[PDB]
Ligand binder design. Structure first.
Ligand SMILES: Nc1ncnc2c1ncn2[C@@H]1O[C@H](COP(=O)(O)OP(=O)(O)OP(=O)(O)O)[C@@H](O)[C@H]1O
Ligand SMILES: Nc1ncnc2c1ncn2[C@@H]1O[C@H](COP(=O)(O)OP(=O)(O)OP(=O)(O)O)C[C@H]1O
Ligand SMILES: C/C1=C/C(=O)O[C@@H]2C[C@@H](CC[C@H](C)/C=C\CC1)O[C@@](O)([C@@H]1CSC(=O)N1)C2
Ligand SMILES: [Mg+2]
Ligand SMILES: [Mn+2]
Ligand SMILES: [Mn+2]
Lengths: 360, 398
């Protein structure tokens, strides 16, 4: 008899809204700032705004909640300041990263019921929600956010845990890489304030080259791939091969010193760890989600890379929706709004009797 | 050839009609380019046909949030803002005391001056011949002025034009009959230049791409210079904003209250619109936030609206596969402006746009006067969201 809440707890951004809505009502940074030296704490937009007078902390590292006290502040801010709701009056669906420790889901269930007294609560895997957002129950998801990247194969609503691949490289590392390679032009970006200028450069000017080698040769013989960017202070800078070298790290992690396999290799390896019978369904339903998958050309390059690894008989399809930055939230909005799904939530009565283990 | 998506069926345009717009043709072309460049859908509220040459002349500044007095759309004062609001458009004449108070407060506060109304032969000949909103000039002997009449619905108010010369500008000073005696007609002038102001370009809505949704899309309330100083951190501000931190007058003039309820995205897009238009340093046409965020929105006063869309909407299947092009279902003029004529057509336009990943910002005041509340969250859900939920329910046995 009430609207359910959806809260996607990302490493960089919290996406919150109401189940039944096509988009979140609140998108703000997952940061808590305490005075550097007139409130005791500041969350989200307010914390970033007052950067120079606060000590900012990120409570979510690689999709996993690491500071439970700071996470309580983010959740409080979400319900009371952003959504302007009474947590005790709405069942709340929260998201969790693939391979989230059993103790982590228990602790956030304990906080939802003890601290916020929610009538009911559900914990969904982010990649699984992304698949639902595209009207699918089978396929493999590449979810690349701000702190972590995952390959999650799913068969009829259920993720296959043995074939889940975690990659500790995501948008934040690409911004640090963009700051590093921008030094190779004589440019300097060092501060936390400057890191946000490089994050804007990356989002506006970066792209994935279909053929990296040919693109590096084109950039070396001509200025056709160059772009100008006006900094806040009015100074205009030129960006050349850094436009495609920054997201190339997703395909060649050795660029950031990582001995890991690229996103295309981990996708193929994940499909190979699954039953041969369902592999066709995974190759044809490869769904891309998260902000780090937003680069123009990432789906064409994925198509080219997977095609090279897979059998020539195999038909490969890359599904990259334009709203794929919000696929995890949309998926949770779809699931929690299906009133036939009501018989799958952990109620407060179920929690009071069994304790935080009920979530498993 | 038909746009069909869930409960939305649009038949193609049969015999397209020419809609007379007040926005000058080069300004529509600029806004069509701004829409493609920025990848946003820009909607602009109506501008009366007779304001076109005034805006096109680039001579005048336009009215911001501090000049709430309405412009006129009849008589010699067409396109200008009369101090006596019984000479303005019908909306202003509805609550005459409110708009008369508005006119005075803007002048008495120093946000505008009381200026004389002068018209050249070109404007006189345009109002008599082109628009037929003024009757021919007839000499009134024992006065030396040319008597002309205009229509105020069931009223025919006379006006007397006196031939005068200012800075070697051979012009007609407009005069009216104030309480029996022959008085000079006053219009609201710019506080610095002292010249009459024209109507502004009011953003109806700005639909941004879903993939670009973020903190910049939060509508913010006007902060005082003191509330804003504590809100920001000096070093992170660009020199444009550091100037406002160190100049209470500059912040009060280019930001704060003058913008109204606005998102950070719209504050920046306003500057892109104004720069692209060559309307700068007092000549700006966009002064504030969108009708999206206007508590005092009157839906009646929002049509016909000109919408500027990213160029892909014009392609053979710009609205999606099998969907077609935007010109097929909505009127698109030579300049690229999608002319939306009423709330129903606006509701349909917004649905097609939402379906193509462009986010709407819905004002509840838009639903006032409507038979059904078209502009609500539920009514405007994405058809890709509804279709995905239907598929997921069918697949998961829900
Ligand atoms: N257009 C874009 N192009 C490239 N990167 C982008 C773009 N838009 C956003 N990003 C990046 O995506 C990240 C935020 O996306 P997202 O919402 O998926 O992360 P998250 O949910 O907070 O993180 P995580 O899933 O790792 O816990 C940031 O690193 C941001 O710089
Ligand atoms: N985002 C906003 N926040 C607050 N007020 C706003 C916003 N957008 C519009 N307004 C309000 O709406 C008004 C816009 O109308 P205005 O431009 O003054 O008149 P109009 O009906 O367009 O006629 P004119 O032809 O300009 O005289 C001004 C202000 O009261
Ligand atoms: C607009 C926006 C985008 C974003 O992705 O922001 C998130 C959250 C943000 C938190 C700190 C920052 C100072 C505050 C606000 C920026 C929020 O950190 C990020 O920018 C990190 C660090 S640089 C990068 O690419 N990701 C990602
Ligand atoms: Mg995420
Ligand atoms: Mn106006
Ligand atoms: Mn206005």
């Amino acid at each position: 008899e009430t609207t359910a809440l959806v809260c996607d707890n990302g490493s960089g951004l919290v996406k919150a809204g109401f189940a039944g809505d096509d988009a979140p009502r609140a998108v703000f940074p997952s940061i808590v700032g305490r005075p550097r030296h007139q409130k005791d704490s500041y969350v989200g937009d307010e914390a970033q705004s007052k950067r120079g007078i606060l000590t900012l902390k990120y409570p979510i590292e690689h999709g996993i909640i690491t500071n439970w006290d700071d996470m309580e502040k983010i959740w409080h801010h979400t319900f009371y300041n952003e959504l302007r709701v009474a947590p005790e009056e709405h069942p709340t669906l929260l998201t969790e990263a693939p391979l989230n420790p059993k103790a982590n889901r228990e602790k956030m269930t304990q906080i939802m019921f003890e601290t916020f007294n929610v009538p009911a609560m559900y914990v969904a895997i982010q990649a699984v929600l992304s698949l639902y957002a595209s009207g699918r129950t089978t396929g493999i998801v590449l979810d690349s956010g701000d702190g972590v990247t995952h390959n999650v194969p799913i068969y009829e609503g259920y993720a296959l845990p043995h074939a889940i691949m975690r990659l500790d490289l995501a948008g934040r590392d690409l911004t640090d890489y963009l700051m590093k390679i921008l030094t190779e032009r004589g440019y300097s970006f060092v501060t936390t304030a400057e890191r946000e200028i490089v994050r804007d450069i990356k989002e506006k000017l970066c792209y994935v080259a279909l053929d990296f080698e040919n693109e590096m040769a084109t950039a070396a013989s001509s200025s056709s791939l160059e772009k100008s960017y006006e900094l806040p202070d009015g100074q205009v800078i030129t960006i050349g091969n850094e436009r495609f070298r920054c997201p190339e790290t997703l395909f060649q992690p050795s660029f950031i010193g990582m001995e890991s396999a690229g996103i295309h290799e981990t996708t193929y390896n994940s499909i190979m760890k699954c039953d041969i019978d369902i592999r066709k369904d995974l190759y044809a339903n490869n769904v891309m989600s998260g902000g780090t998958t937003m680069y123009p050309g990432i789906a064409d390059r994925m198509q080219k890379e997977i095609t090279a690894l897979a059998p020539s008989t195999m038909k490969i399809k890359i599904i990259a929706p334009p709203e794929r930055k919000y696929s995890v939230w949309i998926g949770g909005s779809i699931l929690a709004s299906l009133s036939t799904f009501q018989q799958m939530w952990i109620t407060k009565q179920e929690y009071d009797e069994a304790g935080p283990s009920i979530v498993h | 050839k038909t746009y069909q998506s869930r409960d939305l069926v649009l038949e193609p345009i049969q015999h397209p009609k020419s809609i007379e717009l007040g926005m000058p043709e080069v300004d529509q072309s600029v806004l069509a380019e701004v829409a493609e460049r920025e990848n946003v859908i820009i909607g602009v509220r109506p501008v009366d046909e007779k304001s076109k040459s005034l805006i096109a002349s680039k001579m005048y500044s336009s009215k911001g949030l501090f000049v709430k007095a309405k412009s006129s759309d009849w008589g010699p004062m067409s396109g200008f803002i009369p101090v006596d609001q019984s000479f303005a458009k019908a909306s202003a004449r509805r609550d005459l005391e409110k708009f008369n108070e508005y006119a005075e407060q803007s002048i008495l506060s120093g946000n505008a001056v009381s200026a004389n109304l002068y018209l050249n032969q070109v404007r006189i000949e345009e109002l008599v011949s082109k628009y037929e909103s003024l009757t021919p000039l007839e000499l009134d002997v024992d006065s030396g002025m040319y008597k002309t009449t205009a229509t105020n619905g069931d009223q025919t108010i006379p006006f007397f034009l006196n031939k005068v010369t200012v800075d070697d500008k051979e012009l007609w000073q407009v005069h009216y009959l104030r309480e029996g005696e022959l008085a000079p007609f006053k219009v609201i002038g710019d506080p610095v230049s002292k010249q009459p102001m024209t109507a502004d370009y009011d953003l109806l809505t700005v639909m941004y791409t879903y993939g670009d949704l973020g903190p910049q899309d939060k509508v913010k309330q006007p902060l005082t210079w003191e509330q804003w100083k504590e809100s920001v951190t000096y070093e992170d501000l660009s020199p444009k904003y550091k100037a406002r931190y160190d100049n209470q007058a500059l912040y009060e003039k280019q930001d704060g209250a003058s913008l109204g309820m606005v998102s950070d995205r719209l504050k920046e897009l306003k500057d892109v619109i104004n720069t692209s238009l060559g309307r700068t340093d007092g000549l700006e046409m966009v002064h504030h936030g969108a009708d999206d965020a206007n508590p005092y929105a009157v839906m009646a006063d929002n049509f016909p609206a000109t919408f500027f869309v990213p160029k892909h909407f014009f392609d053979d299947d710009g609205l999606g596969e099998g969907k077609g092009s935007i010109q097929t279902y909505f009127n698109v003029n030579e300049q690229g402006a999608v002319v939306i004529q009423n709330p129903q057509e606006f509701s349909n336009f917004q649905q097609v746009a939402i379906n193509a990943s462009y986010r709407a910002s819905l004002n509840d005041k838009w639903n006032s006067g409507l038979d059904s509340p078209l502009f609500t969250t539920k009514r405007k859900l994405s058809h890709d969201y509804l279709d995905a939920r239907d598929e997921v329910a069918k697949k998961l046995g829900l």
